[PDB]
Amino acid sequence: SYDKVSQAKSIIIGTKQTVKALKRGSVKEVVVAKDADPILTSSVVSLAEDQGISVSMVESMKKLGKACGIEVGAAAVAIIL
RNA sequence: GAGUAGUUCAGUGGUAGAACACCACCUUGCCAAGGUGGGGGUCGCGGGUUCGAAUCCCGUCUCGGGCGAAAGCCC
């Protein structure tokens, strides 16, 4: 949901920073794009599903980053609430 | 008048010079820079002169310009 990402209080942008955020489990929701490379997505959805956190899948990664406030797009973004 | 190494240029009768570019070592994380080494050239082509032609001479191919009715001639 692009709506939940555009809103929310505490978010984090980028795959590396989202997995690093998963390494402390201070994240409430995880939003990942489908059109992104699976080599980069599987790595985060594995740990996300392992932690027991909810895993969402969205269409485009461009509109994702657009919803995050960034101006280039993001492969994976986590709401750290 | 221009034609010379991959490129940009020199070479005003003595077997072809430099810069940049290429290769090799330095140099195993990968490039760049650098510092040392080497390789490469029917001098557009063919004759002529000469011991020796990139250089002078004749012919000829390509390019730019000029003169001319044209053929041709000149730079």
Next chain:
RNA sequence: GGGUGCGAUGAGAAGAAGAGUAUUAAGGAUUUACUAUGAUUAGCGACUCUAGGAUAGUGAAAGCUAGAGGAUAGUAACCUUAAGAAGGCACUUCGAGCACCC
């Protein structure tokens, strides 16, 4: 504010490598290569020898090719001391702008 290019498939910054390396100085050492140079007189032109080539003139000996052998430095290669860097990719944290133009 504007025009491009690039950026979470990581802008940018710092750290870490790079490295006590390249290298500049002060020495030690006297072999390998590269480069420069070879009395006077002829001569445009000479380190010496050899083998081909080729030779008009000048010369004791000529310009090409292929080898081999000599000293003087100037060099890079090897040691010691004191100094001694560096750009980008990859690495590690931080994560949103940076470069060119008016």
